[PDB]
Amino acid sequence: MKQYLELMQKVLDEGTQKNDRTGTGTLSIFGHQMRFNLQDGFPLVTTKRCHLRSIIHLLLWFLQGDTNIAYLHENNVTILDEWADENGDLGPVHGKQWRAWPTPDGRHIDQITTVLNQLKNDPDSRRIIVSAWNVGELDKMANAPSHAFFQFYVADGKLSCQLYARSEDVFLSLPFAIASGALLVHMMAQQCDLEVGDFVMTGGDTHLYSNHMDQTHLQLSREPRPLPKLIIKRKPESIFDYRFEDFEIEGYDPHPGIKAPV
Amino acid sequence: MKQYLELMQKVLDEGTQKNGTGTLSIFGHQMRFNLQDGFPLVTTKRCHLRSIIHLLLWFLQGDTNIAYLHENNVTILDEWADDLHGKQWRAWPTPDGRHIDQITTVLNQLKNDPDSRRIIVSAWNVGELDKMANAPSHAFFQFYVADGKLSCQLYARSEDVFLSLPFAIASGALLVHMMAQQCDLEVGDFVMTGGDTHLYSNHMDQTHLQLSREPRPLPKLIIKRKPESIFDYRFEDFEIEGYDPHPGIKAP
Ligand SMILES: CCCCCCCCCCCCO[C@H]1O[C@H](CO)[C@@H](O[C@H]2O[C@H](CO)[C@@H](O)[C@H](O)[C@H]2O)[C@H](O)[C@H]1O
Numbered sequence: 001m002k003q004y005l006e007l008m009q010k011v012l013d014e015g016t017q018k019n020d021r022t023g024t025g026t027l028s029i030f031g032h033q034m035r036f037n038l039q040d041g042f043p044l045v046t047t048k049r050c051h052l053r054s055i056i057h058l059l060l061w062f063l064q065g066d067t068n069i070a071y072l073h074e075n076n077v078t079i080l081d082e083w084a085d086e087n088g089d090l091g092p093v094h095g096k097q098w099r100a101w102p103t104p105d106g107r108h109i110d111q112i113t114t115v116l117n118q119l120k121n122d123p124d125s126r127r128i129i130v131s132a133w134n135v136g137e138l139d140k141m142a143n144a145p146s147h148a149f150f151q152f153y154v155a156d157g158k159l160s161c162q163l164y165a166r167s168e169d170v171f172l173s174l175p176f177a178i179a180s181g182a183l184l185v186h187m188m189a190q191q192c193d194l195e196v197g198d199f200v201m202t203g204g205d206t207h208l209y210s211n212h213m214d215q216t217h218l219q220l221s222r223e224p225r226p227l228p229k230l231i232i233k234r235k236p237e238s239i240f241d242y243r244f245e246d247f248e249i250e251g252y253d254p255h256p257g258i259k260a261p262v
Numbered sequence: 263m264k265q266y267l268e269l270m271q272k273v274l275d276e277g278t279q280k281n282g283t284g285t286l287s288i289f290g291h292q293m294r295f296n297l298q299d300g301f302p303l304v305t306t307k308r309c310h311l312r313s314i315i316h317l318l319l320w321f322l323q324g325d326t327n328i329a330y331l332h333e334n335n336v337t338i339l340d341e342w343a344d345d346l347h348g349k350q351w352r353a354w355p356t357p358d359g360r361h362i363d364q365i366t367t368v369l370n371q372l373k374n375d376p377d378s379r380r381i382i383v384s385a386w387n388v389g390e391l392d393k394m395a396n397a398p399s400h401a402f403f404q405f406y407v408a409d410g411k412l413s414c415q416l417y418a419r420s421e422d423v424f425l426s427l428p429f430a431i432a433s434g435a436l437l438v439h440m441m442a443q444q445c446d447l448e449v450g451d452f453v454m455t456g457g458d459t460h461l462y463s464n465h466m467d468q469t470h471l472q473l474s475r476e477p478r479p480l481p482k483l484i485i486k487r488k489p490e491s492i493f494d495y496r497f498e499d500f501e502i503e504g505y506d507p508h509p510g511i512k513a514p
């Protein structure tokens with residue numbers, strides 16, 4: 001998409017050399033924001049082939065708050081493989097917190113259910129928020145989630161959402177993030193009888209890995225095609241009751257896929 | 263500032279009416295300030311670095327009672343008190359019932375691992391915010407170091423453009439300067455990111471007044487002294503130079 005390519009180009013034009021924790025090099029910039037008017041079409045990247053199938057399972061899996069990579073491997077989803085251990089446990093890199101923010105008093109807070117009510121009963125609340133950033137638990141932990149904060153907002157019957165990522169690989173994860181947020185907004189809006197507004201995507205450390213230069217140049221050589229449209233073929237009883245089969249993407253004509261290197 | 267004015271204009275132009283008190287509002291904004299281009303104190307109305315310095319300093323002590331904020335005459339946050347903000351920066355409670363000093367945490371990270379992609383302070387403790395009533399409006403921030411330059415991004419879930427935002431920008435930039443000093447880094451950018459970004463309908467007159475003024479050159483922040491720690495700054499360590507704003511605008 002136009003915005004997306006502009007970001008790649010901006011990283012190339014003005015990104016700074018910065019290493020990650022492995023010592024592996026990137027071109028990085030800090031602070032970025034883009035907006036996708038979801039009435040204009042579902043923001044699935046067209047300049048490389050992406051797979052809605054992967055976005056759906058990933059999102060249904062976050063929604064369950066499953067902590068084991070199993071379900072993701074059944075359905076051929078691998079973006080989280082790096083952070084999985086020996087027995088496929090993802091540490092804190094998952095969505096348990098969304099549904100079961102533990103509080104020391106033997107208690108658990110279901111954040112998703114809370115936004116759901118807020119959108120129906122107080123759509124103007126300035127704090128319709130989900131956070132996975134549980135400092136108390138993340139403290140002495142090797143890993144940490146990266147898309148750990150989102151906010152909803154309602155104006156004129158339309159539902160909008162903003163996702164903050166502290167770390168974003170422009171080539172690898174950003175397209176997943178965008179479609180995943182967009183998908184949730186459609187599901188949220190269906191459940192709450194709202195129409196869809198904007199999806200706003202906000203970054204901290206936004207970066208391209210140095211060894212993805214070839215992939216990036218190829219993708220920047222290609223013209224974005226018209227956005228597809230998401231079709232939901234069932235209305236489930238609750239946000240947690242969706243199935244892979246409910247979704248279809250229409251009018252998706254992408255450029256060929258570009259594999260990530262070794 | 264040109265960017266502040268653009269946002270103010272934008273909310274006037276494209277803000278949705280809400281309401282009981284009314285607002286115009288938009289969702290999602292981001293603006294950037296290169297701190298080497300000057301200290302981003304708003305000039306289209308006079309602000310007082312005095313009140314910003316005290317406010318930030320108080321946040322860093324992680325004090326909950328607004329005792330210090332009256333002895334040094336800082337009104338703002340009054341309407342959110344009877345006491346209330348910053349206790350989570352310094353003392354986020356663990357299951358185990360210890361506490362986590364996030365400010366110390368990010369301080370060590372900046373000194374020992376500036377590359378880190380998780381140099382984050384959060385005030386959004388969901389477990390304590392189930393108590394509705396009030397909630398911090400500046401949920402979290404992230405620091406970032408590249409090429410010996412320290413940037414920071416502040417996220418406001420709710421922002422009053424007229425009253426609150428100019429304060430927010432100055433405070434964040436001031437914090438970047440202080441940490442840059444404690445970690446021996448140059449200052450990079452301060453990035454301001456918003457969720458619900460609104461103007462109150464009872465601030466229109468003031469808003470039109472401010473949009474009618476052209477910006478002036480940004481001042482320069484002076485730090486007179488280097489304390490031993492980020493908790494060791496006092497109000498008198500800071501000066502502002504070449505600050506030449508339009509007259510201040512009081513809001514009702
Ligand atoms: C709106 C609701 C849905 C939210 C969308 C969520 C879908 C996310 C899509 C792809 C997810 C993977 O992407 C993301 O995961 C990693 C772990 O958190 C991040 O990795 C980051 O955190 C890890 C810590 O455990 C570190 O080892 C990495 O060096 C660091 O960069 C990646 O930098 C980021 O690309």
Ligand SMILES: CCCCCCCCCCCCO[C@H]1O[C@H](CO)[C@@H](O[C@H]2O[C@H](CO)[C@@H](O)[C@H](O)[C@H]2O)[C@H](O)[C@H]1O
Pocket residue numbers: 126338339342395396397398399400403416420421422426429430433434437
């Ligand atoms: C990185 C260092 C800087 C960190 C702090 C930055 C400066 C803070 C001073 C700004 C003054 C107040 O700003 C902010 O206060 C209120 C509560 O937090 C917010 O108020 C918000 O939350 C309240 C309580 O949950 C609600 O009653 C309001 O509906 C909601 O708008 C204001 O919308 C916002 O304007």
